[PDB]
Ligand binder design. Structure first.
Ligand SMILES: [Mg+2]
Ligand SMILES: [Mg+2]
Ligand SMILES: [Mg+2]
Ligand SMILES: [Mg+2]
Ligand SMILES: [Mg+2]
Ligand SMILES: [Mg+2]
Ligand SMILES: [Mg+2]
Ligand SMILES: [Mg+2]
Ligand SMILES: [Mg+2]
Ligand SMILES: [Mg+2]
Ligand SMILES: [Mg+2]
Ligand SMILES: [Mg+2]
Ligand SMILES: [Mg+2]
Ligand SMILES: [Mg+2]
Ligand SMILES: [Mg+2]
Ligand SMILES: [Mg+2]
Ligand SMILES: [Mg+2]
Ligand SMILES: [Mg+2]
Ligand SMILES: [Mg+2]
Ligand SMILES: [Mg+2]
Ligand SMILES: [Mg+2]
Ligand SMILES: [Mg+2]
Ligand SMILES: [Mg+2]
Ligand SMILES: [Mg+2]
Ligand SMILES: [Mg+2]
Ligand SMILES: [Mg+2]
Ligand SMILES: [Mg+2]
Ligand SMILES: [Mg+2]
Ligand SMILES: [Mg+2]
Ligand SMILES: [Mg+2]
Ligand SMILES: [Mg+2]
Ligand SMILES: [Mg+2]
Ligand SMILES: [Mg+2]
Ligand SMILES: [Mg+2]
Ligand SMILES: [Mg+2]
Ligand SMILES: [Mg+2]
Ligand SMILES: [Mg+2]
Ligand SMILES: [Mg+2]
Ligand SMILES: [Mg+2]
Ligand SMILES: [Mg+2]
Ligand SMILES: [Mg+2]
Ligand SMILES: [Mg+2]
Ligand SMILES: [Mg+2]
Ligand SMILES: [Mg+2]
Lengths: 129, 149, 141
RNA sequence: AAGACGGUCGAACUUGACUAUCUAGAGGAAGUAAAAGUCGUAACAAGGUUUCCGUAGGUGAACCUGCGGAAGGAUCAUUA
RNA sequence: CAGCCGCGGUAAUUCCAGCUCCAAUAGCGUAUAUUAAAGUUGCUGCAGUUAAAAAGCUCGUAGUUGGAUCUUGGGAGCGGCCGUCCCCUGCUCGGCGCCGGCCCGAAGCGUUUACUUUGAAAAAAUUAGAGUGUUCAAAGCAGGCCGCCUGGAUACCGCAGCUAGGAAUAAUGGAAUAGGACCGCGGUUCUAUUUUGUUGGUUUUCGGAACUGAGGCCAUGAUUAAGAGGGACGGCCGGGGGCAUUCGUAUUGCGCCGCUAGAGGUGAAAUUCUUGGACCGGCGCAAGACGGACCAGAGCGAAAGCAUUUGCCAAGAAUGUUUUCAUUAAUCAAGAACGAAAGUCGGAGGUUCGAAGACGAUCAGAUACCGUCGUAGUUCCGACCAUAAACGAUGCCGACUGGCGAUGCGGCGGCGUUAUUCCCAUGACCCGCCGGGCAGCUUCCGGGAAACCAAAGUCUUUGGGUUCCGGGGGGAGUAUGGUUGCAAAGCUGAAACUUAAAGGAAUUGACGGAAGGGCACCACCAGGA
RNA sequence: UAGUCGCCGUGCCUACCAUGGUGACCACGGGUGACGGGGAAUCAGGGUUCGAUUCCGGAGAGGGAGCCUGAGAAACGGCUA
RNA sequence: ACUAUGACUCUCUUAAGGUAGCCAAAUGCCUCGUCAUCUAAUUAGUGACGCGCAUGAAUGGAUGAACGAGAUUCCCACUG
RNA sequence: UCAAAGUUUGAGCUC
């Protein structure tokens, strides 16, 4: 059965961005997804999406720009100590200059660099660059 | 996809967004209940009730017009059956199968379908055991089953 | 992997534990039949007595008469065709003399022409065969 | 003190059972490695009876035939 | 000689010597175990259409994974619309004390885990590491000024246990036959204890445990109904299954009638039948196979597969649906049902064909290919069996990314033709849309060793879930052991030893008793010495 | 359950009752060229193998067993088979 | 292509010329056949070998649990 | 509108 909503959505967008598609409809609306989009949006990687409320699991329409090479997921949700954060971000990213690993925490949903400022380890969700 | 078959049919009811009642309908929940009492007294399932109401009286859903649902109302008045109607219909089906096989011992396909049916029964039975509607000692037993319809 | 579950450590480890044995080399190391069957018994050298001189013929394209020698080990009693290498060294090897034998760099595998000969002679009577071939030392008589 | 009755532990010998490991052994029957034999030429070109699969029986040897499959076939088509 | 490829058959850059030249230098060579190299055991990180590979199919408890839904925000002051510092529990004894009340401090109590951060706690030795002129260093923890001055630090130290902070993600409870909260009223039974100035005793008042009557108030109590799933309903649909029932010709056999001498069969013949009437034709009878042609790149079935008529029995995929329940689900060692042909055991039946077998033919041989006979078997019922290239050689669910026409089913809409005939509403055409379904074509989507695939795609930009299974060829699916079976055999399943290659796709040749084109009197054709 | 022994707690031992406990989360049984650990070698990151060996803990002095003596021994450079 | 043997071929004789299996057995003269085991020692007995004077397929061949007042050989305990 | 067609010194090919 459908286990991971986010896991289906993020593939759908990467198969859009490869084709240069302009706006994308995603069928199951989750709160975690919503937090994820708002994280990338405040930092400027995409435009203004809008969510279609049905007294139900909503839908979401993303107006896509063209700056996103990939937006990936890590299943299963691994715990991540501050020891392993460097090895993860090394092996999981293009470079030491750019690209991000987004992990939700007790503190809240935020980037790994913000986790470095706040002194907060946690559970890896995914990444993008 | 379906559980014990290869079909993957997508056909079902689709309820609309407005949970509001229409303007033309002025039949109250109390009047509908007095109808419920008569029909339950006469002997009828929640399904067939919901069917008639939507057909003649033009009231598609009671859950939407009134607040609570039809089965919980029947449960309040003590019309609910000893066990759920779907298990009722399955054992009745099971019996007719074993009956037809009794003369017709060869029907192998009938044996295969029977066995899948019983697997489906015990699956539901464990759900209802967790939902705390059957007692722990309940048990489908082809010997005793035919007593139950 | 395929089960990328968070709680399948056991299932994974078990599978690995079964499949290591299908690797031919691990099985080679950990079952004893190879170590026991090997007359060297996990050793570099082994002493033995010369009992006869044999000219084994070479394999194809090449064409040669390789000079081997049937030794019998003392500790087990097993019999070996230890090959003497270089030019004119066989006249030195007298019969009924102790020679230290070594391998041939292949870990249980035949080498080229000499069919089934994994062993070569190092010493003769506390005298290096090299020293005899070079002419540094002499045989004690 | 010498000494004796009794209890407990009990070495040791005798026997059996199971159990592990190594091992001799008349003669037989397989595989593999060298050869420039002897008998034929199945197979690869329709290999001159297309090939192969499962299963039965047969024959000095390779092989043969029966029944039902597959094409990795010598046909991706054959006409209201 | 050469780890390997290879060298050596009379000018050997490969041997033995000399002549030189190279690497390393008081050190180098050889052997064996072992490690990186190995993305050749892969969690990070392999493969599984064709190179080795997916259980024949489906059911099934443990195992593993599982939809959505409940707190978001608020107050005062701050910095260059933006960010940050300050704050977001509740329910007996004294002072920031102030004019019995208010607040604070203290004691006790808190629906519960995983997760994360702190501290303590950790034997030294070791490792990393600060300092330090062993004359450098390897070492040591010493030393330095001319009486004095200093060092003899520090870090890492899995996992589990404890300690206090944080509460997003993943569980988990709660009020639904309300034996439901607050705060109250009165009984029944039992008592902590204070009391009547002093000698003694009890119940009360007044406090603390169980039981028991009827209230007032609570916004009074039940998350949605998933393009998750089950079950119901409507008319359909289909070589779907079983049982019983009906029909057809042909067939071979028989009986009878007609004319008659050959018939059979082959590349060419004979054994064979035949003037005791063959073959051929007509009419009757007979038994068991088989249901052609209609029959499609069509349907249904878990899979093998499933097609003469009619009847009975029940089922099901798919469709329409504002039908009910509200997480009941997906995949699965162990265990189980089914499973073409041959084979086996009993009966029943024994028409055809036809393993075996015999003989007749060709042929150097043929114990085969050709022929005449012909046994078991081939048919039905009842008992076993579980193996095929059981092939799409392609496991199941789930999502997304190009078209195009055709088709089968159910459903919907829409000029007109055409039968019901006399309209309606149905039937056949006709033009469309919708769901999933067997297939087809199509392209620089991208992938792939290529052959190829809208899937064999969404891969070094590598993780949606889960089973099975492969790691050089042979030896060998053998042996030994175990288990099943009347037997046949099935299943599980090693090693020694040998060996440097085995294979796939595609290119160019060569060959072809494969086809299409074209030519020549050292080819033929027509002929001649 | 009640005692015995023992410095105490306990099938440690004795007697009388009850009939339990473990198991695909791999027990049970068999193997181990296994004393354990602190550590070493190797390395990109993950890991792999080794570690009798000068510090700690255990066990042992031909094989097994038994004991006096002592605060302390089931001692082996103390005894009896 | 060591000798031996003879897979293979022919011929004479008859209508073919002993296939599958088995043994010095209750069937073998020469014979106490030869080798191994069983004994200190074994012309007996058991297991392989086959040239079988003269094995052999319903004149049935081979096996085979249970049973035998059947024929032989050995071992334990036991005994005038 | 299908009877058949076997072999080839050991005495030296090749980037
Ligand atoms: Mg399933
Ligand atoms: Mg052939
Ligand atoms: Mg042909
Ligand atoms: Mg052929
Ligand atoms: Mg072929
Ligand atoms: Mg024959
Ligand atoms: Mg030289
Ligand atoms: Mg590597
Ligand atoms: Mg390695
Ligand atoms: Mg192949
Ligand atoms: Mg293959
Ligand atoms: Mg399959
Ligand atoms: Mg397969
Ligand atoms: Mg979810
Ligand atoms: Mg017919
Ligand atoms: Mg089939
Ligand atoms: Mg299994
Ligand atoms: Mg069959
Ligand atoms: Mg059959
Ligand atoms: Mg039978
Ligand atoms: Mg025939
Ligand atoms: Mg003949
Ligand atoms: Mg024939
Ligand atoms: Mg198969
Ligand atoms: Mg991969
Ligand atoms: Mg192999
Ligand atoms: Mg080779
Ligand atoms: Mg000529
Ligand atoms: Mg001409
Ligand atoms: Mg340490
Ligand atoms: Mg120690
Ligand atoms: Mg210790
Ligand atoms: Mg000791
Ligand atoms: Mg002692
Ligand atoms: Mg001394
Ligand atoms: Mg001592
Ligand atoms: Mg004998
Ligand atoms: Mg015979
Ligand atoms: Mg007789
Ligand atoms: Mg006779
Ligand atoms: Mg006789
Ligand atoms: Mg016998
Ligand atoms: Mg021919
Ligand atoms: Mg020749």
């Amino acid at each position: 059965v459908r286990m991971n909503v986010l896991a289906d959505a993020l593939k759908s967008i990467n198969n859009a961005e490869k084709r240069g598609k302009r706006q994308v409809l995603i069928r199951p609306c989750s709160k975690v997804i919503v937090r994820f989009l708002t994280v990338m949006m405040k930092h400027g990687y995409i435009g203004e999406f809008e969510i279609i409320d049905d007294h139900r699991a909503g839908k979401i329409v993303v107006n896509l720009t063209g700056r996103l090479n990939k937006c990936g997921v890590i299943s299963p949700r691994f715990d991540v100590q501050l020891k392993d954060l460097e090895k993860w971000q090394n092996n999981l990213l293009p470079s030491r200059q750019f690209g991000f690993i987004v992990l939700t925490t007790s503190a809240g949903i935020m980037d790994h660099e913000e986790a470095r400022r706040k002194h907060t380890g946690g559970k890896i969700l995914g990444f993008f660059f | 996809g379906r559980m014990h078959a290869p079909g993957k049919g997508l056909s079902q009811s689709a309820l609309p967004y407005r949970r509001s009642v229409p303007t033309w309908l002025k039949l109250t929940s109390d009047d509908v209940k007095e109808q419920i009492y008569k029909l339950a007294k006469k002997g009828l399932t929640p399904s067939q009730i919901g069917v008639i109401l939507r057909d003649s009286h033009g009231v598609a859903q009671v859950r939407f017009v009134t607040g609570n649902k039809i089965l919980r109302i029947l449960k309040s008045k003590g019309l609910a059956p000893d066990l759920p109607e779907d298990l009722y219909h399955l054992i009745k089906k099971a019996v007719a199968v074993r009956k037809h096989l009794e003369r017709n011992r060869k029907d192998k396909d009938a044996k295969f379908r029977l066995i899948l049916i019983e697997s489906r029964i015990h699956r539901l039975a464990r759900y209802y055991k967790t939902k705390r509607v059957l007692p722990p000692n309940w048990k489908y037993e082809s010997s005793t089953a035919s007593a139950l319809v | 992997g395929k089960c990328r579950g968070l709680r399948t450590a056991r299932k994974l480890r078990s599978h690995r534990r079964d499949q290591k044995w299908h690797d031919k080399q691990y099985k080679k190391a950990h079952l004893g039949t190879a170590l026991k069957a090997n007359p060297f018994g996990g050793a570099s050298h082994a002493k033995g007595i010369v009992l006869e001189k044999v000219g084994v013929e070479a394999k194809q394209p090449n064409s040669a008469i390789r000079k081997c020698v049937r030794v019998q080990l003392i500790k087990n009693g097993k019999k070996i065709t230890a090959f003497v290498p270089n030019d004119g060294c066989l006249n030195f090897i007298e019969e009924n003399d102790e020679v230290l034998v070594a391998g041939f760099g292949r870990k249980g595998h035949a080498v080229g022409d000499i069919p089934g000969v994994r062993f070569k002679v190092v010493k003769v009577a506390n005298v290096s065969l090299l020293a005899l071939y070079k002419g540094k030392k002499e045989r004690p008589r």
